[PDB]
Amino acid sequence: KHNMKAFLDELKAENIKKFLYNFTQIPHLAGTEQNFQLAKQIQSQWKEFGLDSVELAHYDVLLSYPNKTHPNYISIINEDGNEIFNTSLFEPPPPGYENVSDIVPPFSAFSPQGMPEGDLVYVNYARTEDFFKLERDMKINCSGKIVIARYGKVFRGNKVKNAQLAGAKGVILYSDPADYFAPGVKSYPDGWNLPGGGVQRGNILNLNGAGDPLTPGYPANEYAYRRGIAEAVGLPSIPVHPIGYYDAQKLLEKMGGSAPPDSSWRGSLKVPYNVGPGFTGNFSTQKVKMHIHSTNEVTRIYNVIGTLRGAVEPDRYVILGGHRDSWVFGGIDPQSGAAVVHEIVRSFGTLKKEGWRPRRTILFASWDAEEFGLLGSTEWAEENSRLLQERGVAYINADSSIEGNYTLRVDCTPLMYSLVHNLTKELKSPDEGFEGKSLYESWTKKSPSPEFSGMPRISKLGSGNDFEVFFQRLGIASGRARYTKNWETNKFSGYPLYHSVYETYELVEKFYDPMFKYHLTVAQVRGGMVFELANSIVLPFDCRDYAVVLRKYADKIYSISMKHPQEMKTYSVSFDSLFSAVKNFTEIASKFSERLQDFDKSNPIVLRMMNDQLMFLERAFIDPLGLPDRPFYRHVIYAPSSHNKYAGESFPGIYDALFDIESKVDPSKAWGEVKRQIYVAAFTVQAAAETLSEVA
Amino acid sequence: KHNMKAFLDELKAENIKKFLYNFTQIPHLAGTEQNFQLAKQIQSQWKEFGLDSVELAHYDVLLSYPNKTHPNYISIINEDGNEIFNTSLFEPPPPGYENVSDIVPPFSAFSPQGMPEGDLVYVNYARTEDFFKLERDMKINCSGKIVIARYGKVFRGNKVKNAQLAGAKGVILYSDPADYFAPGVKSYPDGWNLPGGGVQRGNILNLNGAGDPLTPGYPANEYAYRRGIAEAVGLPSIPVHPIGYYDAQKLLEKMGGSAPPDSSWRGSLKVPYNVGPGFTGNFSTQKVKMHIHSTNEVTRIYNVIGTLRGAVEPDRYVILGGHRDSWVFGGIDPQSGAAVVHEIVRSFGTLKKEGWRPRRTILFASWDAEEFGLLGSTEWAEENSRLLQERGVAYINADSSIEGNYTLRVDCTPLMYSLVHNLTKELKSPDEGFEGKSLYESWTKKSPSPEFSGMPRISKLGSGNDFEVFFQRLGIASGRARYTKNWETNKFSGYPLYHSVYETYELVEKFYDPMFKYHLTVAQVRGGMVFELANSIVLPFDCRDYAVVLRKYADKIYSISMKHPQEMKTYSVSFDSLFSAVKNFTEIASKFSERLQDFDKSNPIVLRMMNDQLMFLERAFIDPLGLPDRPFYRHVIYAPSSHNKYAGESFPGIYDALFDIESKVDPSKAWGEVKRQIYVAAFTVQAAAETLSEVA
Ligand SMILES: *[C@@H]1O[C@H](CO)[C@@H](O[C@@H]2O[C@H](CO)[C@@H](O[C@@H]3O[C@H](CO[C@H]4O[C@H](CO)[C@@H](O)[C@H](O)[C@@H]4O)[C@@H](O)[C@H](O[C@H]4O[C@H](CO)[C@@H](O)[C@H](O)[C@@H]4O)[C@@H]3O)[C@H](O)[C@H]2NC(C)=O)[C@H](O)[C@H]1NC(C)=O
Ligand SMILES: *[C@@H]1O[C@H](CO)[C@@H](O[C@@H]2O[C@H](CO)[C@@H](O[C@@H]3O[C@H](CO[C@H]4O[C@H](CO)[C@@H](O)[C@H](O)[C@@H]4O)[C@@H](O)[C@H](O[C@H]4O[C@H](CO)[C@@H](O)[C@H](O)[C@@H]4O)[C@@H]3O)[C@H](O)[C@H]2NC(C)=O)[C@H](O)[C@H]1NC(C)=O
Ligand SMILES: CC(=O)N(CCCC[C@H](NC(=O)N[C@@H](CCC(=O)O)C(=O)O)C(=O)O)Cc1ccc(Br)cc1
Ligand SMILES: CC(=O)N(CCCC[C@H](NC(=O)N[C@@H](CCC(=O)O)C(=O)O)C(=O)O)Cc1ccc(Br)cc1
Ligand SMILES: *[C@@H]1O[C@H](CO)[C@@H](O[C@@H]2O[C@H](CO)[C@@H](O)[C@H](O)[C@H]2NC(C)=O)[C@H](O)[C@H]1NC(C)=O
Ligand SMILES: *[C@@H]1O[C@H](CO)[C@@H](O[C@@H]2O[C@H](CO)[C@@H](O)[C@H](O)[C@H]2NC(C)=O)[C@H](O)[C@H]1NC(C)=O
Ligand SMILES: *[C@@H]1O[C@H](CO)[C@@H](O[C@@H]2O[C@H](CO)[C@@H](O)[C@H](O)[C@H]2NC(C)=O)[C@H](O)[C@H]1NC(C)=O
Ligand SMILES: *[C@@H]1O[C@H](CO)[C@@H](O[C@@H]2O[C@H](CO)[C@@H](O)[C@H](O)[C@H]2NC(C)=O)[C@H](O)[C@H]1NC(C)=O
Ligand SMILES: *[C@@H]1O[C@H](CO)[C@@H](O[C@@H]2O[C@H](CO)[C@@H](O)[C@H](O)[C@H]2NC(C)=O)[C@H](O)[C@H]1NC(C)=O
Ligand SMILES: *[C@@H]1O[C@H](CO)[C@@H](O[C@@H]2O[C@H](CO)[C@@H](O)[C@H](O)[C@H]2NC(C)=O)[C@H](O)[C@H]1NC(C)=O
Ligand SMILES: *[C@@H]1O[C@H](CO)[C@@H](O[C@@H]2O[C@H](CO)[C@@H](O)[C@H](O)[C@H]2NC(C)=O)[C@H](O)[C@H]1NC(C)=O
Ligand SMILES: *[C@@H]1O[C@H](CO)[C@@H](O[C@@H]2O[C@H](CO)[C@@H](O)[C@H](O)[C@H]2NC(C)=O)[C@H](O)[C@H]1NC(C)=O
Ligand SMILES: *[C@@H]1O[C@H](CO)[C@@H](O[C@@H]2O[C@H](CO)[C@@H](O)[C@H](O)[C@H]2NC(C)=O)[C@H](O)[C@H]1NC(C)=O
Ligand SMILES: *[C@@H]1O[C@H](CO)[C@@H](O[C@@H]2O[C@H](CO)[C@@H](O)[C@H](O)[C@H]2NC(C)=O)[C@H](O)[C@H]1NC(C)=O
Ligand SMILES: *[C@@H]1O[C@H](CO)[C@@H](O)[C@H](O)[C@H]1NC(C)=O
Ligand SMILES: *[C@@H]1O[C@H](CO)[C@@H](O)[C@H](O)[C@H]1NC(C)=O
Numbered sequence A, B: 001k002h003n004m005k006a007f008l009d010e011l012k013a014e015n016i017k018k019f020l021y022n023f024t025q026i027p028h029l030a031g032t033e034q035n036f037q038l039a040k041q042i043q044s045q046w047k048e049f050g051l052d053s054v055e056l057a058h059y060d061v062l063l064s065y066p067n068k069t070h071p072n073y074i075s076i077i078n079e080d081g082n083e084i085f086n087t088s089l090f091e092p093p094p095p096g097y098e099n100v101s102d103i104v105p106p107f108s109a110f111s112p113q114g115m116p117e118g119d120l121v122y123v124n125y126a127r128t129e130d131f132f133k134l135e136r137d138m139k140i141n142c143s144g145k146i147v148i149a150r151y152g153k154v155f156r157g158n159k160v161k162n163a164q165l166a167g168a169k170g171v172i173l174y175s176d177p178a179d180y181f182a183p184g185v186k187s188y189p190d191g192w193n194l195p196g197g198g199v200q201r202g203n204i205l206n207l208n209g210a211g212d213p214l215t216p217g218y219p220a221n222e223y224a225y226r227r228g229i230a231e232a233v234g235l236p237s238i239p240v241h242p243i244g245y246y247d248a249q250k251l252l253e254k255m256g257g258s259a260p261p262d263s264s265w266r267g268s269l270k271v272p273y274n275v276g277p278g279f280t281g282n283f284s285t286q287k288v289k290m291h292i293h294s295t296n297e298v299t300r301i302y303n304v305i306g307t308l309r310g311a312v313e314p315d316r317y318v319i320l321g322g323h324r325d326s327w328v329f330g331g332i333d334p335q336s337g338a339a340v341v342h343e344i345v346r347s348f349g350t351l352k353k354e355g356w357r358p359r360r361t362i363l364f365a366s367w368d369a370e371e372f373g374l375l376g377s378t379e380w381a382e383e384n385s386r387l388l389q390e391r392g393v394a395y396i397n398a399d400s401s402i403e404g405n406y407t408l409r410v411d412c413t414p415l416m417y418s419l420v421h422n423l424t425k426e427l428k429s430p431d432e433g434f435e436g437k438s439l440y441e442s443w444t445k446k447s448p449s450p451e452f453s454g455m456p457r458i459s460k461l462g463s464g465n466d467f468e469v470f471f472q473r474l475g476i477a478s479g480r481a482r483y484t485k486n487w488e489t490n491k492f493s494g495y496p497l498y499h500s501v502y503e504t505y506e507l508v509e510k511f512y513d514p515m516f517k518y519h520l521t522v523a524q525v526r527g528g529m530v531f532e533l534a535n536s537i538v539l540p541f542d543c544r545d546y547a548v549v550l551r552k553y554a555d556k557i558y559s560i561s562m563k564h565p566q567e568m569k570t571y572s573v574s575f576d577s578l579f580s581a582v583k584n585f586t587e588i589a590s591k592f593s594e595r596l597q598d599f600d601k602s603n604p605i606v607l608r609m610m611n612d613q614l615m616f617l618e619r620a621f622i623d624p625l626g627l628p629d630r631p632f633y634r635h636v637i638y639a640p641s642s643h644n645k646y647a648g649e650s651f652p653g654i655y656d657a658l659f660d661i662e663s664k665v666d667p668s669k670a671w672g673e674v675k676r677q678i679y680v681a682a683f684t685v686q687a688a689a690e691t692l693s694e695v696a
């Protein structure tokens, strides 16, 4: 039989390993020749693997690179202006790669150029609440200072935006071993920890879904009109640079001014973690000086787009997409995902050569420039938005397949909850001590949901990856899955060697997944989802699962507002409309589900009708006006957190209207906007429900 | 057979007459009890006529009414402050209606209150070019003046906006017999001309598609959050009032200052048409004083929504919609359209009772508050936008069925050109001297297209009626049809008794259409369109007709730019991308059409696929970002003219970027924005074409 089991059994751990090795011997930085070569290789192989068509789709987008003859670095500079200490110009290369060229040195992509000098302030994680503590409670003024912040907790773009709004004239990011050195584990190459010389690359934009900074709304094609740099979306206004913890120690050890306000401000280095500003008395006259000379340049990028045409509904698209560009070798990020996609394509291709075709069209993508702000996925979606809107069933992302070796992690729309439960019950656990048990059992045991015993944790989608355009802009049902570390010990730092030169094939093969079994399990989950989405007669979405979470989110946002009982009385703030819409959604979804079960299975229009209702249900949550000042976050139920792009926020319009509201100067106006967002949300929920009513 | 002929033959002229009579004995002003009663009657009858469901959909929207105890009027006031002349408080009621109550006196809906006093300036039609002439050429400054303008040529909202931007502190509108008294024809009741005491009501908003001024984007339902008046969309900032030409003569006869600049500024009254400012020397000290006390109030309105469920594609909607609210009796506007809709419903119902059902769902609508800014259609569409977007095949408007008795008028999307040609070839001409000829022959003969001999004129859609939300906001293929006057003698004033108390059943029965044959022909055209849209196996749209007009519009916009050859050189302004996209659209459409003819007719998915491609083709022309500063005009090919809401403009983004560009102070910036709009247009055309490519 050509069924799911046949697809699944064709997947091999050994193939994934071979592909990972192949994808990680040289760097594949976006906009470089090597990454164009790999794109061409992937195009050739997907064709050999059997896809109907495989094309490259290119765009000319704003990218950012250090100046090869004028290196970025930071100094302590004394009263004379001598540079008495200089941070590193490069990460020490790992064993066996010390003759690789074209390793981009660490840098913060899209930093402007500058050589600002000043006194340091230490801002912990540079979260919103860190700056509130500093300015409101401790009375420390960041204006005209250089801030130094530890990586972790939130997206670095948000740190930078926060620093900028507090009046910083520069930012220094560093990796603290409190957040990037796990107890008992050795540094690379002898373990999976971050060495003192290791540094995390990454962009520092605030794009809010825009894609290419120069072409928001439209694909960056050959005749595109570009904004000038000054009007570009999302660029930082102050220089920024990241460093490792050997260098950070040198910058922090002399800090004076106030003590840290409590122990959550102290990392693990042997320094006091004083907030500053400036250094202690004997060095009070020494300053910190940044030297940043990176340039932004419009550079060509390449996506690979593979098509496996549907036999019955070719005009319905199930998308498996993940990026190919890497900061350096991309041993985990992204090639552990890309190798998984490559084997998925290969298995689908195997079935196709034997005469099978999925019911619906499956599109496979190798995105470029994800690391520079989800640019390749976003431009392609801007180009193809009409097709996607009207034909897009689902998007399954495929970045890193592992960030740990403990259990499964799934983040997805509620419409895929049942599909994920059912699929994982039919998969074998790869976990030691669950031999012969299902993945569902091991995952449920190791990652219990906070809400329902006997069920696993499944998180909402946040952002910081290539599903953003599909989900929060276009309203296409999306999900992602990978192996991860223990939730209980999770410091929300990411894995230690993230975006460092030390992220290699060997890191994976020696320390994460030597048998490639976690990789195989992830290929089965991702591939399994795609198979069912593209092949099930009735789309495998359960609208009732949305009803359930909509109620939970409504309770949650209600409870936030209810911290302000007096204002809710004065301004007549009622959540009744939203709770009513959610009740209605629950009732209508319930009846739709009965019809979906009892409808006449012989009738294909009835079937296409009801599948259209399932497909356009995620779509119904889009507001074409967008969220306030964020036109590309159009989904009313889910946006990336305004304070942390990686985190998903529910009812974001109301959440942001309520955030810090006790500090607004015109409460009448602030509570009015809360009410406005309640109306918008209730209306959208009701409207989404009504798409599931009988159509006539 | 239950076919189109059966539908068509059931329509009766005598039924339309009876309905017109029934709909026009008392006023049906939006937000009044009488208009609620008629809505309930229409709901009851559509149910009796056989529709599956018939509901009222209500909204609470901003409306505008004069103060019943404090009348609006205008004065000439002398140096002492005595009011030496006062305009009328009411139009003399027509014979037999002099005891009707609740005739709203003439007023400009949404005028703010005020009693400004000042000197008059006469601004001809208050078009953009009239103010350019006045300010640029004649050097007359309207700041702090009261302007007086004749009705005609353009939408009155645009006149008011233009006056406001020239710094007027008030506006007076009047009907000139040059534009509202046809040669040789007597005044009402003895003919169809405007009497000296007649006055044209109408709103003066600049909504740009927003709907209810207080709730842009969202339906004005029970829990809606409303903007404050100061943030409301589209309200005028200066008082406005309309008058008849007896009163206008009194205001104009004393005007001094400059002479009119040429004869196109002179109407037909016995006055010099001096521009002013102010009166001639002996009366130089007399002033004009307006008294406006109307109030804006949130008022409930009611649409009637009838459903005739499709037998095969119930989830596909063909909409026949037209308004029910009238300024007074609504003898032409809108009840000549509504009576036509009523008989259409009745015929469809007749077929249904005999067991027939259309292939697709037909929705019938009786919209409210059209006269106050297309409010009822717009709110309903805002409420139902998700359904309409994904399921809306077509919208056929049904306001006034006649504005003349000479020939057919059709304005529609190019996608309906072939459908209209074919349908009219099968209809009988009602025209004297074409007995036994087809409607197509008479229409083609009396209204030849400017472009192709042997073909009739078909115009682009403008706005000022209830198709606006469907077409320019949502991208649903739309059209309208009615009998009209001779194009050759058309002064683009409208019919003389437009929006006056004199627009009655008798006006129609005595002077326009005594046998109700033009009405019947219009019911066949409108009903015929609906039938074919809702019943044809393959949607009756021809994408190739869009290709043809896209080329014509591209030539046109190119030619406007080419008036500025030097700037096009300096700024590298190229239209190549747009011409390329149009070429591509032509080629792809051509191949789609071949497939549509040759595809395998047995296959219903293939059929649903290709019909989806036809349905979503109009949709592809929508840009979700909207046009600049006009977020609800989202169609890239067609918007209402920025200078005249009634007129359609093609490539409006580029057109407006080019308008008056030689006057911009920063040409670099202005030409940049031209280029930006070219890119947007070319991209959108290409994207629309690609929806017609093979799907996979
Ligand atoms: C969740 O789903 C429920 C049940 O479907 C919806 O219930 C609707 O609730 C609204 C309130 O928001 C009701 O609105 C009321 O309608 C009355 C007239 O309704 C009749 O006529 C309509 C057509 O116009 C029919 O469709 C309907 O079935 C009835 O025949 C009005 O008279 C009411 O207005 C009066 O009272 C209000 C309330 O105090 C005053 O503000 C007004 O000034 C006025 O005096 C009112 O507008 C509506 O009828 C309900 N519909 C149905 C079918 O039951 C919820 O709205 C929905 N939740 C959300 C968030 O959408
Ligand atoms: C109307 O339809 C036509 C024909 O389909 C479209 O033609 C495309 O035209 C664009 C130009 O806008 C061409 O773009 C060029 O692509 C070259 C590479 O193309 C190859 O590889 C791609 C995948 O990446 C394949 O899909 C394609 O078939 C080819 O195999 C580039 O090398 C070109 O860039 C170089 O030259 C330009 C031009 O001087 C320089 O600016 C660059 O810096 C660079 O040096 C160029 O980008 C495209 O290939 C054409 N496609 C096809 C299939 O023919 C029109 O674009 C379309 N009109 C509109 C408005 O959409
Ligand atoms: C602090 C940290 O770094 N973490 C790890 C982030 C890993 C991001 C990675 N994505 C990825 O690197 N994308 C690029 C580009 C993203 C863009 O430009 O939007 C990037 O972030 O620089 C991925 O999705 O796998 C831990 C963390 C996870 C979730 C939460 Br809620 C809170 C904290
Ligand atoms: C000058 C004039 O009045 N004309 C007649 C207009 C008749 C408008 C009428 N619509 C209708 O009255 N609508 C209402 C509400 C519209 C709104 O608020 O948007 C209104 O205009 O006050 C209709 O569509 O039949 C002639 C004219 C026709 C076309 C062109 Br291009 C140029 C001139
Ligand atoms: C990764 O695998 C690819 C494909 O097997 C290798 O690329 C091939 O290189 C061989 C030897 O030079 C050529 O003859 C083939 O034409 C190549 N195929 C394609 C599709 O490009 C590539 O050499 C491998 N890379 C590494 C680092 O091992
Ligand atoms: C990278 O830095 C180098 C050298 O430090 C830059 O080269 C100089 O640039 C300017 C041109 O604008 C010249 O005035 C100098 O004479 C150049 N000096 C040398 C030694 O080459 C170079 O411009 C920078 N590269 C980028 C892409 O910005
Ligand atoms: C840090 O790096 C800087 C720049 O390379 C060093 O200062 C330079 O040293 C050379 C050689 O003495 C001088 O000619 C340059 O003029 C100096 N440049 C600047 C900007 O000061 C500095 O010596 C290094 N410091 C340490 C401790 O290694
Ligand atoms: C791969 O799995 C092993 C088994 O859990 C991990 O090793 C253990 O790590 C935990 C701390 O989380 C300790 O409690 C055990 O004592 C460790 N045993 C060892 C190292 O043999 C290992 O950390 C995992 N690898 C990765 C990269 O996460
Ligand atoms: C997940 O599996 C469950 C259990 O098989 C599916 O629910 C069943 O669906 C069948 C077929 O419609 C119904 O007749 C059974 O009553 C259902 N059982 C229960 C407990 O609901 C469910 O549909 C599957 N989910 C998805 C998305 O496929
Ligand atoms: C317009 O026609 C309607 C319907 O025929 C008339 O309304 C009917 O009035 C009669 C007599 O009062 C009642 O018995 C019916 O119940 C009414 N029907 C409905 C559906 O409302 C109405 O009287 C006519 N109006 C005019 C001005 O002639
Ligand atoms: C319409 O005009 C009347 C009378 O010219 C207004 O009535 C007056 O309004 C104010 C209340 O704000 C009172 O101070 C007066 O005493 C009222 N006078 C009389 C004679 O009634 C009325 O307010 C206006 N109506 C609307 C809807 O604005
Ligand atoms: C125009 O109308 C106004 C207002 O009704 C008239 O002036 C009023 O006349 C009465 C009676 O003489 C006075 O008590 C009011 O004080 C006047 N009001 C104002 C605002 O002036 C005026 O007489 C009328 N003019 C003509 C020519 O009919
Ligand atoms: C109804 O049709 C008649 C016939 O054309 C119109 O009457 C003619 O009007 C034209 C001017 O456009 C003259 O050339 C003829 O001399 C007129 N003959 C008449 C009045 O008998 C009449 O105007 C039409 N009615 C309406 C409302 O437009
Ligand atoms: C308008 O009628 C024309 C002529 O019948 C239709 O075009 C014909 O369509 C048939 C059926 O597809 C083709 O085989 C003929 O070749 C066509 N003739 C020509 C000259 O094109 C056309 O499809 C009708 N238009 C609509 C919208 O129905
Ligand atoms: C921070 O410092 C700068 C100038 O040195 C000043 O302009 C700004 O107001 C300060 N803000 C606060 C809150 O102290
Ligand atoms: C028009 O008149 C007013 C003041 O009476 C003045 O402020 C304005 O500048 C004038 N504009 C021109 C162009 O004359």
Ligand SMILES: [Ca+2]
Pocket (backbone or CB within 6 Å): A210, A211, A212, A214, A215, A216, A217, A218, A219, A220, A378, A379, A382
């Ligand atoms: Ca873009």
Ligand SMILES: [Ca+2]
Pocket (backbone or CB within 6 Å): B210, B211, B212, B214, B215, B216, B217, B218, B219, B220, B378, B379, B382
């Ligand atoms: Ca509204």
Ligand SMILES: [Cl-]
Pocket (backbone or CB within 6 Å): A397, A398, A399, A400, A465, A480, A481, A482
């Ligand atoms: Cl992922």
Ligand SMILES: [Cl-]
Pocket (backbone or CB within 6 Å): B397, B398, B399, B400, B465, B480, B481, B482
């Ligand atoms: Cl109409």
Ligand SMILES: [Zn+2]
Pocket (backbone or CB within 6 Å): A323, A333, A334, A370, A399, A400
């Ligand atoms: Zn990645």
Ligand SMILES: [Zn+2]
Pocket (backbone or CB within 6 Å): A333, A371, A499
């Ligand atoms: Zn990454």
Ligand SMILES: [Zn+2]
Pocket (backbone or CB within 6 Å): B323, B333, B334, B370, B399, B400
């Ligand atoms: Zn009308």
Ligand SMILES: [Zn+2]
Pocket (backbone or CB within 6 Å): B333, B371, B499
């Ligand atoms: Zn009207």
